[model samples]
Target: MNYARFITAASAARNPSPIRTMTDILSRGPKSMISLAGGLPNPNMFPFKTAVITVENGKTIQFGEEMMKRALQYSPSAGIPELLSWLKQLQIKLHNPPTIHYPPSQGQMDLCVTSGSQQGLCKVFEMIINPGDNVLLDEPAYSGTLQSLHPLGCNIINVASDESGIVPDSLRDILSRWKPEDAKNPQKNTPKFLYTVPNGNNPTGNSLTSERKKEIYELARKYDFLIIEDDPYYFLQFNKFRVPTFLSMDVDGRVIRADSFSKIISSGLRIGFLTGPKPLIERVILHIQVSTLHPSTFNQLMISQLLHEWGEEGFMAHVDRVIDFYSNQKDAILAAADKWLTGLAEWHVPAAGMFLWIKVKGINDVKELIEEKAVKMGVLMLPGNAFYVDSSAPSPYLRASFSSASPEQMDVAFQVLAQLIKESL
Candidate 1:
């Protein structure tokens, strides 16, 4: 008997993700590289001191030590009850929804604790999706979500999106035309979920308006499908207008909301939670019990301690500081866009998020140019293809992060990038 013949095909044939592949190539390339590719937060502003004060010195170490020990040990599947209650309060303050006690198991609602929003989303696909299930996604959706859904062998339908974010009319039209036969059978192909990053959308740096969100919610109600509102950047919205979330409008519990600590608190701690009807969360909790056991109790306890110390107002103040930092960076990038690429490039001033998605003129293969020319030229920006589901799709866009780079480095980086675009033409 050949041992190789015994291995499962799915386990053997998985390919590396394009983003990780490209990142590996870029990482090993050069020393003078100024990368605008990654969506990482500024290292300078990460709340290490805040964590130290709140956790190490702020009595979280003592009060939370037992919890930390439990965290290291295996814990309950639905998460620690006390921490879940604190999260419920946090949600009430943020979204003003009705009170929830036990987690939901199916239909229109659920709640689960995951290592991050990424884990929450992965479990969602794992539970509901069968091979060839139709999953609708925004045009420039989060790459990580796309990657997670890919291996499940689902048919991904791309909904048209603009700078204002996903168009509800387009989504309605897509859903209207979708057929079970198209996915090979009625039982296998029915639409499973619609995913979106409503606020401070990545790569494109666009925010969906309240009107747009309301319209999408109505469509979700009409079509009777789940809406995965993967909103890690919800708190990162720097605009004057506060847009309402799909969860807030979800009276029927049609929306599953995934919130993260990556953007607001700290990425390293990897704390995130999801809420919906009880059934869905219960399904996710089953998955969590087998795989993660539970999200790190120490991390959750530390976050709860921070919330207790800071309260709502202090948390808002800290977020405002981060918002201001990125807002200023955005202005600087746009100014540089005006100064350097004046006639060579086009972009919308992002209302929120770290990226300035620039569509450069006459540059068809921007990814290659970035890999070879831009690296040689001493500046970098992520090719727009990184954000899309299909890399071969025509695009002249590039995503540049303003979250981490220093103001002085931003000026230099943009200047170099602008020069590359100008010279390419």
Candidate 2:
């Protein structure tokens, strides 16, 4: 596959900063051979000497003088070397992309850390999409992604999805609608990529099944477009066994996956990573080069220390605890909904993630109901219009997050929402 075909002309035109690129090259050379190629600040100029972080589980990580210097300094755009290496290992342990062992030109999987998975998504879209390009997305998509793509002037083609996540038939129908001849023409508007959440989708809280994931992979293969599997909520599944990931099934190396620690660990840390074919990963790295200059070196070191402290087994155990907490939260919200919204509204039981997507029984649009009455009535939920491609379109749906509220609070909130819906009718 000529990966260059997916790259936007703007991204292709970018040249890496000469000084930064030189600094990166010198970084890999023998320590004794290092000379003046780029301006690198002396560690003595920085004040910090040592740092200590205590985990909730009574463990402490102490960064000594050497570690502190590395932490405070500017690192590679791809990631701090140690953290990137660890993340690559984790991806192999988890997803094991089929082409991991192959060379870059032959579709070997590679990864780079981003400020957050959100940034990686933005960079990937920026790298691939040009003005007037057609892009595929699941309906009621992540608003952040929509915000990024909207400015690029790409045509968003929404694929219908339900409680099972993006429907395979809808994707196939949309792809098949494009004639083979026109699709082959560079001037035509054939979709360059498909963006999907796949696991515990925001707004909908839907997860795709393994079989469905396989079907979608096949669709990507048939349509000859890339799949941006933005899966921040990968580890949040309520089930015992995880559904197969798009990266795991990417024999064609057509999938780019964004994974984050925000949900499982701390959002404030702002650490995430992208895994995909090497050439595309290189483009995102170049974007990183010009933008944030790499994710916060301190934060990357912090996560690196944390992951080192908690080996793979310990990490999985921590994730299990998170899952258990959210599972209970999900149950509490569902119980509240059943009690208060039985006749007033409808929702699918969330398989993962933090939201309940509710459709009011009789309302044509819940915008006014949620924004005006629901808030004034002491309840709050995001209007469904926020999730759609056309934000102005009327939607009977509203999204309620179950991640933070207490059980009693949820019950009371839904009770208020029920009353508001009743009064509206």
Candidate 3:
């Protein structure tokens, strides 16, 4: 794969900071190894001495003098080494990328931590996309992604999706427009990558089947484009068995995955990780060096300590509880919709994630209904036009999140929504 072809001139122009590189080298050296390098701070002079945290599970994590010094200070751009290692191990245990065992020449994979998966996604888009470049997106996409991509001046080509996430036939039809050789030629304007939320997609609350991912991966190989799997809700899966990830079957190192702890862990932690080919990860590391420098070291340490306290099994056990809570929430909304929205609106039972995508029957566009009436009527939900590439396009759909509201609240909200739909008709 021609990795260089994907990088923008701006991203290609960024170079490693000399002081940052020296700091990285010094970090790997022995404690006794002293040098007149960075403007190092004195840990003794710092105000913070020690800390203790009590989690909901009754486990307490303490930060002693040694750990406090590490937390208070700046760390490597990749991540605090311990947290990065833990995340890599988690990814391996979960996805087990085929590229992991390969030699560097044959394409090896690595990871870096980011402020959030959203930040990682933005940086990756900044790294790969150039102005007027043709980029593929799953339709009714995450608004955050659309917000980031629109400014970059990339032509967003929509790939149709239903309740099962991205439709492979729609993807095939888009890719089929370009010859295979067009993908190979850097000079041609073939798409650089296809951006998708593989599991528990935002807004739609749907997941792509493993077979669909395999078919998509095959298309990527045949068409020679990268796949950006921005899956923040992978752990929120409602299935009996875990769905396979795009990274799990990345034989060609063409998939870049962004994983997050926001849904499972505290969102305020602002920590997420990216896993991809060594070369691409290195670029993201440079991007981080120039941007936020790194995700908060103090926050990373807290998570690291928590994960240490809760072993992988313990961590997964907590995940199960979270899944159960959301699953109940999903049920509450479904029941409410069935009772209140049976004929007024249509929907799919969300397999995963927090949202329920509803298409209002007999409504050509719900933007006006939502903006003009729904909010004023004491019920709130997002109008679906916000998720589309072209916001001006008439969208009868609306997104309702089932993550927070109570069953009674949902019942009342949808009841009001049904009344509003009838009034509109």
Model 2 alpha-carbon miss at residue 165, Å: 1.2
Which sections of candidate 2 miss by over 4 Å? 19-34, 180-183
Native-vs-model 2 lDDT?
A: 0.87
- Residue 299, model 3: lDDT of 94
lDDT of 3 by residue, 371-396 (tens): 88844889889999988878998999
Give lDDT tens digits, candidate 1, residues 95-213.
86542542332233345668988888787777777676678888786778777777889889988888889998899888777543443334434466788888778888888888888
TM-score of 3: 0.96
TM-score of each: 0.81, 0.96, 0.96
Residue 108 displacement in candidate 2 (angstroms)? 1.1
Question: What local lDDT does model 2 show for residue 200?
Answer: 85
lDDT of 1: 0.71
List the pairs of residues colliding in candidate 3: none
